Nucleic acid binder design. Structure first.
Lengths: 246, 738, 288, 138, 138
DNA sequence: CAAGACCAATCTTTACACTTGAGTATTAAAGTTACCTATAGCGCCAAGTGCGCAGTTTTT
DNA sequence: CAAGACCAATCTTTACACTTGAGTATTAAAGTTACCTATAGCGCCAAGTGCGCAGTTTTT
DNA sequence: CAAGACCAATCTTTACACTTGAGTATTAAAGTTACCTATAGCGCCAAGTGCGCAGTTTTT
């Protein structure tokens, strides 16, 4: 049975006490303000950390525990999934004779919130949570989303370091997981993915993974939802590959 | 070996299943068709697609994946040894090298080739079949010659016993003509026809003229080679023709395979579906015995050698069974050469395959292996116990009537060695179990020194639980604190009362709760008191007394063929008041048969019984100071232990509690003389106790939930164990069926 | 034939999609007299009611009948149509178990109000069943048997004293036999089939009723296995079992491999032994 | 597929006692909407009427249902039950001819009010037929 | 019964892959007395000849026989084995026509030397046949 | 300029060689294949019957 | 920079509306759905039993 | 006195002989049969363990 969260589900199991006042007073649940979010800097990357005292942290953690963990995923996603691991991400490529490794540039920053809403819509009932002002799905997205003060142009952004960002990334990228898996399998290539790192292996004797056609096709598939391939991290080799030490 | 591994991803009920470590006999058990028939379907589909047969593709477990994969790893070490040798320059060896082993040795250099040759290497060949979303099929090896050769070298034979045909023996011929490699192609069928008609002719030509007339009459297809070989064999055989019929079919099949494969390098895989169907249990045991005899008679080792013994690898035999007899005989006869596979269901409904340990290093356990032990392999939930009293209690029909959940749990008594070499934890099996043991197996109390001492099994449990002595920090600190308290249990001394019968301040219930809390992760539950101590509790004493009244009022009879004169004479001789004990001893006795007595005799017996009941109640309430002493005396009299965990024999040997022992002896020799035969542990007093108790309470209350509540109140600890087991059973049933 | 009908259920060749015996059984068991209810009156009655417009359904059915050449309805067909239309459902290893269990439930429930007492013979009920499934089948049969049982103690609306149908079933599995013996107590009989000197069939009754309730409770798979034994060697201790079961020793003596060695206490031997059970399963009691 | 159904009738392997295609055909051809008529309402309605005493038939059927574990009724099963109960008869070389002739009669008669136009393919209609019988069938 | 055997051939339910009646017919029709030829003598004789090495085929067959529990050979089985081994082929709408035509050819050809005169009854020989095919069969 | 995806047959099916149970450098004989075809409107020649060998569109 | 290939469900199966046989501008009610779940080590509190809510590697 | 109805096996199944297609006086070989059994309580002999050969009823 597909999971379906409705108004009673949000009120009882998810909100519990974190948003009791906002649900009894019929006041709209507000956006995650800049006061609750601190901005750490790690090299060229910026990480967003929410304070634990805020109710947003509690609702996000319970959202991970009870809702996001029940939505089905694709078997090629070996990251942030129950039972997945890096070794499981490398294992299916032992049978391959040629190897190719691709990366996605700014995977979490390029996840459009519209795609997230379209992905999470079928699993959330189309009801009005608060009168006729705010919808249940919009309230949950308020729980998961954020607006970066550094970059106000993009508006809604899924930031790294949140409670729910990895699982939401996996759910939104299940579409491309399916598309790339179908393409690679019809080409005879074993495909697997760990976060933004995609690994392909050809067991037959062929130069398919070395041609520019394969990179062009993967880029064309990724372009559907707006992603790009990091050309600095593109690797192609025969008979052995040294992926980040392994 | 023949097959190293089989891997199925996202097909039918399989999410990601890998089967390996195949032994010579593979026994498949579990709940029906939870993946057994699915595994058979997967193997059959792979071997049908190997031979380029147009068969329907399998369904996907979940449509959120684009493809489903079946990977077969063949063990080609022996074939490499066969062909790489210089002596065998035949055409078949040459073709096998050019197909299977080339394109993998060409890439190698001289050093690596030498290293592969000289080392004790194992060679594998992996073939993967991928089913895409649009029914297309892709192989990891694009050469059909490789697939056909692999099909030839490792043929798959499936024998179904339910739908077996006792008159269609075509698979026998299709098997024998293929197994032993005779090259009849060099022998021309033209030359053979002329040759045979030269010989079998009564007059040279007469048979030939008759056959030529027939052939001119009959329009026949050209003979296929397999038809030629089948004709050859079954003509040369002295016979074409051949429940028990199916057994003979299967037994001859296995005999033919094992005998014929000894000279060939073809190693078939044979899968049997319910070999025991329609078989008497002795017939199934004899079938396994005959298979093992054929297996071992052709077996050559460092000891058994001679003409007629081969070192050729045997075919791999899977068979899916539902009968404990087949499994018991396999385990007993095959020793270390068999594997038991358990099929169950995951959380999301997918199939889960486990390997149950069926190999025992204790030869005594192998010999004593019987039907009861082999039954546990089919158990949904096991409650391992220590004594016969536990089996008497937990198997009580009346008790299990009120708790249908516990009816699915099998109660088995296991010794320490038996538990050591049978338990699922050491077998890493997903058959959930609980080991019910008393707290006395960890700590033994000394009254003379007033000191607890630690049993070796407690030290073993501590050593198993202290795995954090070699690792980093996490939220396990409370466990370490509990283990520290367990360590401090040794040094502490505690004072006793009434010469070592009760504890002054200490509650063994708290320590038992702590032990259970700590050890629940090791699947062992430690009951605070013995089963006989759990039944005789302060809350159930009235009913216990009621039971005694019953065994006085209904189960007692008169020991004389003439009740009238007998009862009158002993009424005269012995006074009712001052000599009630000898009067009851002479008049009444426990007997299964209750002869009919007269109205006056019945009234006199009833009056004497009521007087004795009142006397016994008075004396029980008088001789013992409090109800706790009464409970303790009853527990010891049936073989129980005190709060200090001491038996009557232990006290007698040690010499403590002299007054209590003498009081109990007086009661057993004077007042409870009739209940003395039921004082033993094996007397079965538990069954009568529980039956009378449950019937009485059912007479008291008419609601099932209420009756369960009353039983829970009367036996808090036994019912607590039953309820915990039932909750775990429901949780694991939702783990399987939910 | 009517008063004592015979129903034979074969489980091997059972048909999980052909449920015709169910209808042929239920329409016959409970005696409803639909003959007094005219099929003409019934047809007019039903088409009066189920019609969306009074006649519209009737016009459609009349057109069909003018098109389709039908035999006159037999009474049994009428009753089957009645019942399974009124039922909220026509459709329904484990499938065979459910078939058999519902068969037995229907028989036991429906025979309580009738004086017809059928005899039901089942051929290998345990075929294709997990041992726990067979035990649960016997448990469900016993639950149905006892829930409808009225005695001097159990009385009320919903409990009858009508005699139950006689159930034969031929089994090859110790699980079925063990569960029967444990659950049915004094109400079951065990029949042993063997061969005489001249090859003719010999039938005996094996004592399966025990007065020792402890033996009934402790009854397990090993004890129920002895009922299929060709020859029994009753012993007294575990050492005897260790010796006489030794694989190497029994390798040299294939004749003794057909004898089951069982340890029996004095009470167990008293209430199990074939002599007191007058059974032709030869045995020897080895004692010091 | 719905608007242009395909019916294949083989006469050699025809089953003179299995008439399931007849019901699968008639229940589909004429479009009666029994979905609006609740099966709960229908069960209460029918057991209200056919009961000798209001409830007696219902008590018997309720006992049966408590005894028998049944799948929920499919709509096609519901319609087939409806039709062949309302019909005055469920039962029915020359037998195959009658089977085929009634099949064609049912199709031609029932399709007149519907916009569904099936395609029917018959394999050897004359097999096992006297020549006059085949001519009479046509 | 022996002198005037009755053979019934049904064409509707004919089995294009079960040719057992052909063998049961030919082995009986022409009277060859293989009883005088000992099956012991025949087995030794055949295994003497067909052996690649005298005994090698015999050793293989002896191993098989020790493995396989076989009934004693019946005479009809012996004759059928004889004939269809000596024949250059065991295997063989239009398929039924060929079956029937070869049946009739075998009967008519083989009965010429014997005094056994069978009676053959055919049920619908033309079933599933093009008219020209039936005319060609006759 | 520059590249992954480079038909489907080709006769087919079965299959150990060496000295009788284990073995460390590269296909094939054989039974059946298992049956095929000259020359279609025009020219030569017997001399008007019979035998031997000046279109459209599209690619372009 | 720039693009063909932009999941799989979402409850499911069946099905005419109008005035009784032909008809020229856009889904759905209904029977069944048909049954689900709070809270797994840590903190609060009764105060040590019982109940409520300071790692590695990889992505980065 | 006088008579129709005078077991079921006995090893079983198949089958031409004479000179190659028609023929006017009487069963059988052969492959398998295809495998069987001494001696049961009492007497002799080693001499009390082990081995060899004084009922009822009904017919009467």
């Amino acid at each position: 049975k597909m999971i379906l969260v409705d108004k009673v589900f949000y009120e009882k199991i998810l909100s519990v006490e974190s948003f009791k006042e906002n649900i009894i007073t019929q006041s709209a649940i507000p956006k995650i303000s800049n006061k609750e979010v601190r901005l750490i800097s790690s090299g060229s990357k910026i990480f967003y950390a929410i304070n634990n005292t805020s109710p947003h942290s509690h609702v996000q953690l319970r959202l991970n525990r009870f809702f996001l963990s029940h939505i089905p995923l694709n078997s090629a996603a070996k990251a942030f999934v129950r039972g997945g691991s890096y070794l499981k991400y490398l294992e299916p490529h032992i049978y391959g004779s040629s190897y190719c490794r691709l990366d996605i540039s700014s995977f979490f920053n390029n996840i459009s919130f519209d795609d997230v809403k379209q992905s999470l819509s079928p699993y959330i009932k189309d009801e009005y949570l608060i009168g006729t002002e705010q919808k249940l799905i919009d309230a949950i997205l308020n729980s998961v989303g954020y607006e970066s003060p550094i970059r106000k142009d993009k508006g809604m952004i899924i930031p790294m370091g949140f409670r729910t960002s990895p699982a939401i990334s996996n759910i939104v990228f299940r579409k491309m997981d399916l598309l790339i898996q179908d393409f690679c399998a019809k080409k005879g290539v074993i495909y697997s993915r760990y976060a933004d790192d995609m690994l392909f292996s050809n067991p037959r004797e062929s130069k398919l993974l070395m041609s520019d056609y394969f990179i062009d096709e993967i880029s064309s598939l990724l372009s559907i939802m707006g992603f790009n391939i990091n050309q600095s991290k593109y690797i192609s080799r025969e008979k052995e590959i040294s992926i980040n030490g392994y | 070996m023949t097959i190293e591994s089989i891997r199925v991803k996202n097909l039918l009920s399989f999410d990601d299943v890998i089967l390996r470590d195949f032994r010579d006999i593979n026994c498949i058990i579990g709940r029906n068709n939870v993946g057994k028939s699915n595994l058979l379907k997967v193997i059959r589909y792979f071997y049908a697609k190997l031979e380029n047969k147009k068969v329907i593709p399998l369904d996907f477990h979940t449509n959120y994946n684009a493809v489903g994969e079946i990977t077969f790893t063949f063990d080609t070490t022996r074939i490499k040894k066969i062909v790489t040798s210089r002596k065998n320059n035949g055409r078949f060896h040459k073709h096998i090298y050019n197909t299977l082993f080339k394109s993998s040795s060409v890439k190698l250099n001289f050093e690596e080739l030498i290293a592969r040759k000289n080392s004790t290497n194992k060679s594998f060949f992996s073939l993967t079949l991928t089913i895409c979303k649009d029914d297309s099929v892709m192989w990891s090896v694009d050469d059909p010659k490789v697939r056909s050769l692999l099909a030839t070298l490792y043929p798959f034979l499936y024998i179904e016993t339910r739908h077996i045909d006792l008159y269609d023996w075509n698979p026998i011929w299709k098997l024998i003509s293929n197994l032993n490699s005779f090259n009849f192609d060099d022998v021309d069928h033209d030359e053979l026809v002329n040759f045979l008609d030269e010989k079998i002719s009564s007059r040279k030509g007469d048979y030939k003229k008759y056959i030529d007339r027939v052939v001119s009459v009959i329009d026949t297809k050209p003979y296929t080679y397999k038809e030629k070989v089948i004709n050859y064999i079954k003509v040369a055989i002295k016979g074409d023709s051949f429940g028990t019929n199916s057994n003979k079919f299967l037994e001859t099949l296995l005999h033919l395979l094992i005998t014929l494969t000894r000279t060939e390098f073809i190693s078939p895989i044979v899968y049997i579906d319910e070999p025991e169907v329609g078989l008497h249990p002795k017939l199934a045991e004899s079938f396994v015995s005959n298979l093992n005899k054929i297996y071992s008679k052709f077996k050559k080792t460092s000891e058994l050698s001679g003409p007629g013994r081969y070192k050729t690898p045997y075919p791999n035999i899977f068979y899916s069974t539902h009968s404990p007899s087949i499994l018991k005989q396999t385990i007993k006869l095959f020793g270390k050469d068999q594997q038991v596979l358990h099929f169950s269901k995951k959380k999301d409904g997918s199939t889960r395959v486990n390997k149950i340990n069926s190999t025992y290093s204790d030869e005594r356990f192998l010999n004593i292996f019987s039907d009861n032990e082999a039954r546990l392999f089919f158990s949904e939930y096991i409650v391992f116990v220590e004594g016969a009293t536990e089996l008497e209690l937990f198997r009580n029909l009346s008790l299990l009537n009120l708790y249908p959940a516990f009816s699915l749990a099998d109660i088995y008594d296991a010794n320490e060695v038996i538990l050591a070499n049978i338990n699922p934890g050491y077998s890493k099996a997903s058959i959930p179990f609980v080991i019910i043991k008393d707290i006395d197996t960890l700590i033994d109390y000394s009254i003379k020194t007033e000191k607890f001492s630690l049993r070796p099994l407690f030290e073993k449990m501590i050593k198993e639980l202290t795995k954090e002595f070699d690792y980093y920090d996490t939220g396990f600190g409370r466990v370490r604190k509990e283990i520290d308290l367990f360590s401090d249990i040794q040094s502490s001394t505690k004072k006793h009362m009434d010469s070592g019968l009760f504890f002054k301040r200490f509650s063994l219930h708290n320590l038992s709760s702590r032990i259970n809390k700590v050890s629940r992760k090791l699947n062992r539950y430690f009951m605070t008191t013995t089963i006989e101590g759990a039944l005789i509790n302060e809350q159930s004493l009235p009913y216990f007394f009621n039971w005694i009244g019953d065994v006085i009022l209904t189960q007692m009879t008169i020991n004389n063929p003439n009740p009238d004169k007998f009862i009158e004479a002993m009424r005269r001789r012995y006074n009712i008041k001052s000599q009630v004990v000898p009067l009851f001893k002479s008049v009444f006795c426990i007997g299964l048969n209750h002869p009919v007595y007269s109205s006056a005799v019945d009234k006199q017996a009833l009056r004497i019984k009521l007087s004795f009941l009142n006397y016994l109640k008075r004396k029980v309430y008088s001789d013992f100071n409090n109800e706790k002493e009464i409970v303790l005396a009853l527990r010891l009299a049936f073989g129980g232990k005190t709060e200090t965990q001491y038996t009557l024999d232990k006290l007698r040997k040690d010499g403590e509690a002299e007054l209590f022992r003498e009081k109990i002896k007086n009661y057993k020799n004077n007042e409870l003389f009739f209940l003395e035969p039921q004082m033993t542990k094996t007397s079965g007093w538990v069954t009568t106790f529980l039956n009378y108790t449950i019937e009485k309470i059912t007479s008291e209350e008419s609601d099932d939930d209420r009756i369960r509540q009353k039983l829970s109140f009367i036996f808090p600890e036994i019912i607590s164990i039953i309820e915990q087991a039932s909750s775990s059973i429901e949780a694991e049933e939702s783990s399987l069926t939910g």
